[PDB]
Ligand binder design. Structure first.
Ligand code: CUZ
Ligand code: CUZ
Ligand code: CUA
Ligand code: CUA
Ligand code: CA
Ligand code: CA
Ligand code: CA
Ligand code: CA
Ligand code: CL
Ligand code: CL
Lengths: 572, 572
């Protein structure tokens, strides 16, 4: 539970950043932040959102200075974390991102078409992560061209993204909306909760029905239908779309108690658990009974194997791999450990007690996460509870309070609070992985994708990134290529004309671990990272004529303050 | 050294964010991050840099998505922290910010004229903080208009800003350049180190002279000159400028060993210590002899009371108020604890040993900080060393490694490492203040300056922010006012035309601490924080026609997911 100087943490903790936009890498159990991976935010340090490389990844036809990421998930191979990728959603601007875990950098960014607010997101587990499943939370007209604002004709869709290409594979139109989602351990099924079957906007209308549902998607059927060419296209997108509304061979709507929120798959792979929220219950769906349900051999609610009452406001559930479940109670402000088997029995008529313990969590719990819970290897050692209010938990810091993610020891019979972790800009879910499930690199290979465009442009200009220090003029454009080692840039002076579009390419020749350099052009709003053997580039417009210094902003040597240069801008 | 769940830290830690741009509030000794104060960066969560209130403070005639802050400092009254303000520099885009500690929010941002790269920054101690002292590191021509790029005619200036106004008071032209700075405990003197007395750009040139210097500013004489109107102006700035180059009544250049970096004032108020960097020494200037020096009664070097050899790469120094100093040795990678009195004796010819202890610090130490070291009340209990490399200290996370700020117990006669705190995007210096020296507010007053502009616009529109939910049309401009409580916005639908400049004002009526709300408009790159009793606005351009949902991104209630609305954009 304690990590001293010189010792290392056992698990990596990938924390969603919420509406702050980044992904935070913490070490567990110390609970310290080890790194920040910019994603939908603009990082002033590494220059993510500023550098050309990052802007090419972000794409889009408009620059977004924000994002809202909630659900980080790691790629899998046969129900086990393989550590290659980490995917996460953007509810603010309808995007999904992919992070390269070998270097901890956003790799791909995709815009989901004809849909709005990507919220729920999870990956396929078996045979491996071929599909990234995403939920669009808000219903809108199809197409959303402004010719019909009515909620009557507003719908949302379920989106499947090809994990290796990050291109959308297909979308499934559904009824109501989509909140959270999860997949099984076969690859055939995926499911999502719904809280707005009423497709209303006002509160009163979204709480109307006593029950909403859990939509089950038959990925096998859906994929077949798309392969056979039986699909349509919406708007200007070419993405294959299938209809999963009403009586469809692609979907099954299992009614669930009021505005269900979380939806979690158990490690054993036989239960999809929907969280009640408005209903003080949880709904346990049997994945084993799904085949018959899609064959109309049984009734919709026959898939329900249990629906135990736990407390007020259940939002998310996680598992210890020992048959117990842990659910957060928002309103009662606590986490509840209960036995699934006992819940199955109690549901059938028994009197067995299924609730084993209730631990008071410090102010309104949201997501819940137990180590390796999303894999066959759920070890039941650690449980993280991410609360939404910190009230008096930490020193006062103004009207804006931090969130409080508490580390709880669940390796034993009883839950024991171990650490109170203050956090910024509301994280939602998080995922822990064993130190050995990730294979990190320390220095870049010169053919790395993260700067393939840089050498492509270099080849055209006839420059050798690893040794040249040239200035190339191309009309109003000016490309400057520099090299960096020790406390010096391969170039300490260059001239351009006011208004010129200047691009600077910095290639870091140092090969010693942790010897990172930076580049910052004064009064030009430019900054970027250049770790060992990397090439990064940033373009800006030269300001009014005069002298503008540039310097390394990454302390790299005793002569760091001196790692400088001057850009001379003359009247055009 | 340990803070258990439920307990509180003893000191607040205000960490600089380096080129990441923000200020970080940590609790000591837990070393946990309690809050992030956006300053020069753009926060996707609170909306700093996106909201109208922040953009108004940011000012400027250009948008900057980046910043580089190194030195956070807290206002004082008679040499003691008074907890009213925190000031920090921006080296990337030449600015200085001010933070209101009552709400932990940036309150003022000033662009410094005719100068570049604000680095060193520190406050006046006695009688109180009236002046904010800033160093500009890179020499530029005066004025910088592109008619003469030569280094021969490039210079920099020492800037004093009025703390309460945040308007530049005056500037002092100097020879060489300016690195770091500190002030005495009387109000008469301020001093800065210089590493480029050669005013060169190439590495070898900046190291040419055996000695550089510490420039001492007679503030008393500089203010007198300004009051009498004996000053000039440069370029478009009306700021008073005095010449401190060569033989001046305003300045005194005390030669100090090779490219000195840090410059710290001892708690007893009698020493200005310059760190030798390229020289394995430290230079102790007696502030007591400064009066005679500005009267030419003594020689420049006569002010030097000690110049002890400590190790390779001394960068910064701090004190325990017990007569001992602690210096970081960048190259030898360690912190050195030496007695100041003994160094004085040794310099006089004695044989006494001044070095008490050398503690290996984990990889290249930068800034150094002892609790309350900048005030008369230096308690000498905690020491924070902020290193630039972490290497094997934490779990691997890619080519980019985190920094390592180590907490050291110094209350005893022996330094003892206690904690290894990983940190993102290079923080430089930090300041620790007692829990009781900070008086924070939990909710806003409806007359808070932070939204004065909002209610001034409200008045003109004849709207009562605390109870109105109206849509005021102003040609192509549309001002939407909404109220907010529990899980609902006071409005759930409004219309505008494609291309309309929409400004959404949100007022949070809840009175319960920690009950914060947010606002985000899907696909419009907008997000903002609205804490208890606060009003905030954000303006954007209505995109193409169609439906666009807006929602609360600050988990505030069990019905948080439902706290939404719809903006309908119709073809113009
Ligand atoms: Cu925070 S939802 Cu978005 Cu995940 Cu419970
Ligand atoms: Cu800017 S320097 Cu030793 Cu302060 Cu980092
Ligand atoms: Cu490169 Cu500092
Ligand atoms: Cu207001 Cu969530
Ligand atoms: Ca409902
Ligand atoms: Ca909160
Ligand atoms: Ca020098
Ligand atoms: Ca570093
Ligand atoms: Cl979930
Ligand atoms: Cl300093």
């Amino acid at each position: 539970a304690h990590v001293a100087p010189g010792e290392l943490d056992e698990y990596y903790g990938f924390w969603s950043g919420g509406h702050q936009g980044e992904v935070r890498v913490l070490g567990v159990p110390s609970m310290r932040e080890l790194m920040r991976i910019p994603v939908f935010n603009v990082d002033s340090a590494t220059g993510w959102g500023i550098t050309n490389e990052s802007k090419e990844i972000l794409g889009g036809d408009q620059q977004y200075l924000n994002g809202d990421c909630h659900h980080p998930h790691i790629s899998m191979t046969d129900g086990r974390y393989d550590g290659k990728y980490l995917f996460i959603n953007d509810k603010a601007n309808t995007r999904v991102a992919r992070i390269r875990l070998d270097i901890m950098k956003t790799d791909k960014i995709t815009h989901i078409p004809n849909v709005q607010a990507i919220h729920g997101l999870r990956l396929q587990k078996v045979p491996k992560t071929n599909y990234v499943f995403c939920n669009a939370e808000f219903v809108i007209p199809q197409p959303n061209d402004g010719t019909d604002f009515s909620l009557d004709n507003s719908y949302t869709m379920f989106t499947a993204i090809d994990a290796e290409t990050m291109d959308v594979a297909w979308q499934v139109i559904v009824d109501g909306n989509l909140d959270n989602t999860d997949a099984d351990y076969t690859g055939k099924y995926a499911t999502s909760t719904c809280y707005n079957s009423e497709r209303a906007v006002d509160l009163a209308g979204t709480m109307r029905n006593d029950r909403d549902w859990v939509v089950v998607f038959n990925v096998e059927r859906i994929a077949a239908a798309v392969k056979a060419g039986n699909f349509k296209t919406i708007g200007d997108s070419k993405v294959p779309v299938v209809d999963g509304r009403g009586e469809s061979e692609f979907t099954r709507y299992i009614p669930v108690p009021k505005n269900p929120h979380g939806l979690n798959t158990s490690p054993d792979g036989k239960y999809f658990i929907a969280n009640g929220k408005l209903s003080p219950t949880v709904s346990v769906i049997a994945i084993d009974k799904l085949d018959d349900l899609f064959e109309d051999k049984i009734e919709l609610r026959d898939t329900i194997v249990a629906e135990p009452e736990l407390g007020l406001g259940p939002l998310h559930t996680t598992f210890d791999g020992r048959g117990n479940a842990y659910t957060t109670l928002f309103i009662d402000s606590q986490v509840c450990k209960w036995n699934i088997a006992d819940a199955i029995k109690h549901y059938n008529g028994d009197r067995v007690n299924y609730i084993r313990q209730k631990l008071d969590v410090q102010y309104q719990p949201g997501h819940n996460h137990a180590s390796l819970t999303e894999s066959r290897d759920a070890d039941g050692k650690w449980l993280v509870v991410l609360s939404k209010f910190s009230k008096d938990r930490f020193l006062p810091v103004g009207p804006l309070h931090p969130e409080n993610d508490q580390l709880i020891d669940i390796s034993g019979e009883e839950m024991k609070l171990v650490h109170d972790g203050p956090t910024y800009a509301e994280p939602h879910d998080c995922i822990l992985v064993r130190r050995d499930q990730i294979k990190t690199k320390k220095i870049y290979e010169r053919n790395d994708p993260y700067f393939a465009s840089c050498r492509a442009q270099a080849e055209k200009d006839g420059v050798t990134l690893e040794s040249d220090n040239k200035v190339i003029r191309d009309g109003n454009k000016v490309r400057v290529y520099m090299t960096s080692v020790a406390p010096q840039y391969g170039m300490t002076d260059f001239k351009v004309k006011e208004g010129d579009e200047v691009t600077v390419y910095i290639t870091n020749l140092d090969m010693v671990e942790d010897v990172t350099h930076g580049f910052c052009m004064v009064n030009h709003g430019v900054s970027m990272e250049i770790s060992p053997q990397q090439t990064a580039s940033v373009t800006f417009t030269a300001g009014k004529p005069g002298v503008y210094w540039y310097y390394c902003n990454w302390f790299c040597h005793a002569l760091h303050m001196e790692m400088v240069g001057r850009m001379l801008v003359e009247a055009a």
